[PDB]
Amino acid sequence: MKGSRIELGDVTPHNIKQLKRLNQVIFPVSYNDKFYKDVLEVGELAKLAYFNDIAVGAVCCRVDHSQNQKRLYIMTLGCLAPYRRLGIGTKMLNHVLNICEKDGTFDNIYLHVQISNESAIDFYRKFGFEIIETKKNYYKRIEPADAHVLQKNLK
Amino acid sequence: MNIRNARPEDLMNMQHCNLLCLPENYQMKYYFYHGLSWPQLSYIAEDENGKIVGYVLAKMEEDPDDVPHGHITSLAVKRSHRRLGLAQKLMDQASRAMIENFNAKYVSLHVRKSNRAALHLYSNTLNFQISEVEPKYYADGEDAYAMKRDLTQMADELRR
Amino acid sequence: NLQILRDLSLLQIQMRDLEGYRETRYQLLQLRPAQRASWIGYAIAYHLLEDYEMAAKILEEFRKTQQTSPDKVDYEYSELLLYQNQVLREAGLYREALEHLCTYEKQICDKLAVEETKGELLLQLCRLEDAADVYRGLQERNPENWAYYKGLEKALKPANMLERLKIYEEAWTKYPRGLVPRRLPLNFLSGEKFKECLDKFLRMNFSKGCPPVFNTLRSLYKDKEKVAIIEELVVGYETSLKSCRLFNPNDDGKEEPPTTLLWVQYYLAQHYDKIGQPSIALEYINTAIESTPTLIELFLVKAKIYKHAGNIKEAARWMDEAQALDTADRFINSKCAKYMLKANLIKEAEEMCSKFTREGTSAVENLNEMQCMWFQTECAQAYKAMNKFGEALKKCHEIERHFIEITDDQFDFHTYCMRKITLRSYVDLLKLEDVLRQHPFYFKAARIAIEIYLKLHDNPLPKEELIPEKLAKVETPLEEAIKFLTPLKNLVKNKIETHLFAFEIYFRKEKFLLMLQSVKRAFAIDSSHPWLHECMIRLFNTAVCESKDLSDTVRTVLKQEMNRLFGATNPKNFNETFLKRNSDSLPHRLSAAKMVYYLDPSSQKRAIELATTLDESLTNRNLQTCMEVLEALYDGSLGDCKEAAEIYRANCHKLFPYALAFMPP
Ligand SMILES: CC(=O)SCCNC(=O)CCNC(=O)[C@H](O)C(C)(C)COP(=O)(O)OP(=O)(O)OC[C@H]1O[C@@H](n2cnc3c(N)ncnc32)[C@H](O)[C@@H]1OP(=O)(O)O
Ligand SMILES: CC(=O)SCCNC(=O)CCNC(=O)[C@H](O)C(C)(C)COP(=O)(O)OP(=O)(O)OC[C@H]1O[C@@H](n2cnc3c(N)ncnc32)[C@H](O)[C@@H]1OP(=O)(O)O
Ligand SMILES: O=P(O)(O)O[C@H]1[C@H](OP(=O)(O)O)[C@H](OP(=O)(O)O)[C@H](OP(=O)(O)O)[C@@H](OP(=O)(O)O)[C@H]1OP(=O)(O)O
C-alpha cells in the first residue's frame, strides 16, 4: 500500500478524447459517439487508470436490469501493452468490486471475453469469475467471433 | 531554475505567463497592486536566459473580524517546465514570507474541482485541507474547492 | 492651500520634472510637517535627482520622530529602515550602511532583505570569513537561488576545479531535493569529471520522470566536446534499457519501470533536433508515441521538430492533435493558436482562442481587453506575411496603445505608496515607467510597423477606433515610422537593429548627417554585421557619384569620417575587403553578393556563384539563411536569375528534405 504510483481518475469532458484513444488502441472493436456520451453520465463506474501520472488504461461500466435482477456489465477493462503485468488491471477491477459491496443491491457481475484472449481469462479467473455461457457470432469482423460469458455471483 | 523574489520589472512577464496558461486573467494594474502592497510574497522562477517560466502571486487578506491569513491569487508553471519541483518550491518560499512579515496563521485559495494537477499539489504535498465547496464560483459554471493550510507547524521550525 | 499643491505634484511626478517636483513637496513639508506623507514625499524627490547624501538626512530626521509615535506599525517601520539602508548603499557609503544595518536588524521583519544586503556589504569590505556564513544561511532558506552560490565562490575563493566543486558537493548531501546544486557543476566541469557528474544527473531525472531534462541542459549544448559525451551516454542508456531494464548492464540495482525507456527516447528526440538531424528525431519520437498515445508532451515535441525542419503547416497539425486530449490546459491551446498564426490560418486561430475566453464578446476583442500582447504580435506578423499591410498596422498600433495604458496605470500609486510606507517597491516602479518600452514585446511590434512603412514608401498601393484601410492609405508613411523609432532610439541602444532601422528611414529622406550618425553607432557594436555592410556600401556610393546635389559645408565634412572608417579605396574594394575577411560565413557571403551586383549590374554571374555556395565548410548553413538566399534570387536583388533560382532550390532540397520553401513545383 505504501508507495503507490498507480492511481485512478475520473473521466471528464476535458479528457474524453484520451478515453477514446485508449479504447481504439487496446480493443479491436469500435464504439460510436453515443457510447461515449453515456459514459459521462454514469459516475464512479467509469475511471481512467494512471501510472506515473500518464493515462495507461480505463474501465467503463453501466447499470443493467435484466432477468429480474440488478446486474453490472463491465464493458471495457484493459491497459496498454507496454504497461501490463504491473497491477493496473487489479486496481481497476477492485474499484468496480468496492462499489458493489458498498451498495449491496447488486446481484451479478458479468462480461464477455474473447475465446482467443486466454491471458484475460486467467486474470479474471483469480477474482472469482466462472465461464457460464459460450456465445457464437458475437463479434462481427474479428477472426475470433465467439465469446465466453464470465460471471461473478455476489449473493 | 533560479527561484528568486519578484521585482516590479518582472511583473509584466508574469502577466504573459498568466495569459499563456490560466483561464482566469487579470489586468496590469492588478499586478502593480500585488507588488506595492505585499512585495515580499510574490516569487518567480526563471532559466539562464532570464525569461520567466513560473510565478506565484500571493497576498494577505485585510479582514478585521479574523486572524491575519494569506491568500494565493495565482500560480502557474509553463508546460515546458512542469514536473520539475518548481511549484512546491514556489509556495514554500511564499508561505515562509507570510509568517515572518505579517504573522499569518493560515493561507487559503480556490481550486477547481477537476484540476487534478493542482489537487495533488495542495493536498498530497503542501497539505491543504478542503474547507468549503463553493458552487458555480467560476465563469463556466464549475464548482471550486476552498482550501486551507495551517501555518503554525511551519512557524515553529523557524523559531527553532 | 492643500489639494491644489497635492495634485500638482501628482502630475509632476507623472511627467518627471524633478526640479519642479522637489519645489512642490518642499512647500507641503512647511505646511503640513506632522503627516508622514510630507516627509517621505520630500525624500523621494532627492532620491530621483541622484542626490543621495541629502536624501539620507531627511530619512534620518523622519525616522527618529516615528519610533516614538504611539500609532507605530511593525511592518511600516521595517520598510522605512530597509529603504534608508538602500540610500546609504547607493551613495557608496558601504561602511556606515553595515553599521546602520547591524543596529536595527532586530526591528526588521524582512529577514531576506537584511541577510542579502549584509552578505553583499561583507564582500565589498573584504570580510570574507563572516560573509561565507551569511551566504550559507541564505542558501538554507532558498537552495534554488543562483546568487547565493556566486557569493560563496566570491567568499571562499577556490583555486582549482577540485575545491570549487566542494561548494556544490556539500549542497547535495545537505539538500537532497535541490536541482540547482546538481546542475551548476555541469557548466564548468570537463572531461571524465564532467561525465560521472552528468551521469548521476540523468539517472536521477529519468527514474523520477521529469520532462524538462532537456530544457535544463540546453544551455551547455554550444560545445562540440560536451555534446559527444551526452550523445554517447543517453544512447548507452537507451540500448540497455530495452534489453535488461537497467541504465548500465553492469550495475546492481532493481529493474526499471517502462516509463524510464520512454523518457530516454524523449531526450534523444530533442537531442537530434538540436543537432540538426530531423530524420532521427522523428524516428525516436514516433517510437515513443506508439507506446503511450495519450501523452501530451510527445505531441508538443513532434510539432517542434517539424517547425525546425521547415514545415509549419505540418507542425500546426500536431498542436491541434495535442489540445484534443486535454481541453482545460491553456498552454497547449495558446501554443496551438500560435502555430496556426505562423501557418497563416487567422480564422482557424480565432476559433481556437474562443475556447478559453469570455462568452459575451468576440475572441480577438477579449484578448485586446486582456492586454494579450503575444497574440497581437503573431497576428501582426502573419498579416504582414499575407500582404495584408493594413490589418497588420492595426495590431501594431494596438500593442503601442497597450503601452500608453500602463504608463498611465501608475497614477493611482503615488498617493497609495505614501499612505502605506512601501518605499522600496514604489521607487522601483518609478524607474520602471521610464524604461518600460525596452520590453521585448515593444521591439518585435515596432519592427513590423517600420518594415511595413518602408514598403509603403517604396511601392505605394471613449477613444478613437483604428480602421485598417485608413492606416495603410497614409500620405506620410515615414513620419508614422519615426514615431515607432523614437522610443527605440532612446531606450534600446544595445541592439544593432535599432541604429540600422534608423538608417533606412533617413536613407529614404536624404539626410546624410543622420545616416552617418546611425552607421557610426552600429559600427561600434558589431563591425562584421552583414546588414551593416549593406548600409555603408549604400552610404559610400551616394557620396562618390552623388557629389553635386549637396551643400558645400555638408560635403566637405562628410568625406573625412568615411576615410576614417575604411581605407583609401573606392566602394568596390571595400566589398572585396569585406568578402575576404569572413568568406566562410554564409550570411556575410550573401550580403557581399548583393552589393557586388548593386555597384555594377554587369557582374551578375559572379554575384550568383557567391551566394549559392553550399559546401560543408561554411558557417551558418542552416535553414534560415538558405531560405534568405533563395528569396533574394526571386526578389530581384541579384537580377533576373530565374534559371539560377531553380538549380539552387533543388540543391537546398537535398540538405533540408522537409522544408516547404524548397519543395518542387
Ligand atoms: C474477449 C475480450 O476481448 S474481453 C477484453 C479484456 N480486456 C483486454 O483484453 C485488454 C487488456 N487485456 C489483458 O489481458 C490485460 O493484461 C489485463 C486486463 C489483465 C490488465 O491487467 P494487468 O495490468 O495485467 O494486472 P496484473 O497482471 O499486474 O495482476 C493480475 C495478476 O494476475 C496474474 N496474471 C495476470 N495475467 C496473467 C497471465 N497471462 N498469465 C498468468 N497469470 C497472469 C498475475 O499473477 C498477476 O499478478 P502479478 O501482478 O503479481 O504478476
Ligand atoms: C491559481 C490557484 O491558486 S490553483 C490553479 C493552478 N493551476 C493553473 O492555473 C493551471 C496551470 N497548472 C500548472 O502550472 C501546474 O500544473 C501546477 C501549478 C498545478 C503545478 O505543476 P508543477 O510545476 O509540476 O508542480 P510540482 O512538480 O512542484 O508538484 C509537486 C507535486 O505536485 C503533484 N503534481 C504536480 N503536477 C502534477 C500533475 N500533472 N499530475 C498529477 N500530479 C501532479 C504531484 O503529487 C507532485 O508530487 P511529486 O513531485 O512527488 O511527483
Ligand atoms: O512562449 P514564449 O514564452 O514567448 O517563448 C517562446 C517559446 O519558448 P517556450 O516553449 O519555452 O515557451 C518558443 O518555443 P515554441 O514556440 O517553438 O514552442 C521558443 O522557440 P524555440 O524553443 O524553438 O527556440 C522561443 O522562440 P524564439 O526562438 O524566437 O526565441 C520563444 O519565443 P519568444 O521568446 O521570442 O516569444
Residue numbers in the entry:
A (entry chain A): 1 to 155
B (entry chain C): 1 to 160
C (entry chain B): 113 to 573, 638 to 841
Study text:
NatA forms complexes with at least two other proteins, NAA50 and the chaperone protein Huntingtin-interacting protein K (HYPK). The trimeric hNAA10/hNAA15/hNAA50 complex is referred to as hNatE, and we refer to the tetrameric hNAA10/hNAA15/hNAA50/HYPK complex as hNatE/HYPK. NatA acetylates non-methionine containing substrates harboring small N-terminal residues (alanine, serine, threonine, cysteine, and valine). Taken together, these studies reveal the molecular basis for coordinated N-terminal acetylation by the hNAA10 and hNAA50 catalytic subunits of NatE and its modulation by HYPK.
To determine the molecular basis for interaction and enzymatic crosstalk between human NAA10 and NAA50 enzyme subunits within the NatE complex, we determined the single-particle cryogenic electron microscopy (cryo-EM) structure of the hNatE complex in the presence of inositol hexakisphosphate IP6 and bi-substrate analogs of both hNatA and hNAA50. After refinement of the model, we observed clear density of IP6 and acetyl-CoA cofactors in each catalytic subunit, but the peptide portion of the bi-substrate inhibitors was not resolved. The structure was refined to an overall resolution of 3.0 Å, with most residues of hNAA10 and hNAA50 subunits resolved to 2.5 Å. Indeed, we find that hNAA15-Thr406 is located at the center of the hNAA50-hNAA15 interface, making hydrogen bond interactions with the backbone carbonyl group of hNAA50-Ala55. Additional hydrogen bonds are formed between the backbone carbonyl of hNAA50-His14 with the backbone amide of hNAA15-Thr439, between hNAA50-Arg21 and the backbone carbonyl of hNAA15-Pro405, and between hNAA50-Asn52 and hNAA15-Thr371. hNAA50-Arg21 also makes direct ionic interaction with hNAA15-Glu433, which is absent in yeast. Interactions are observed between hNAA50-Glu7 and hNAA10-Arg116, and between hNAA50-Asp53 and hNAA10-Arg83. The hNAA10 β6–β7 loop displayed about a 4 Å shift toward hNAA50 in the hNatE complex relative to the hNatA complex. Given that the β6–β7 loop of hNAA10 plays an important role in peptide substrate recognition, we propose that this shift in position also contributes to the inhibitory effect that hNAA50 binding has on hNatA activity. Notably, the β6–β7 and α1–α2 peptide substrate-binding loops of hNAA50 within the hNatE complex superimposed well with hNAA50 bound to CoA and substrate peptide.
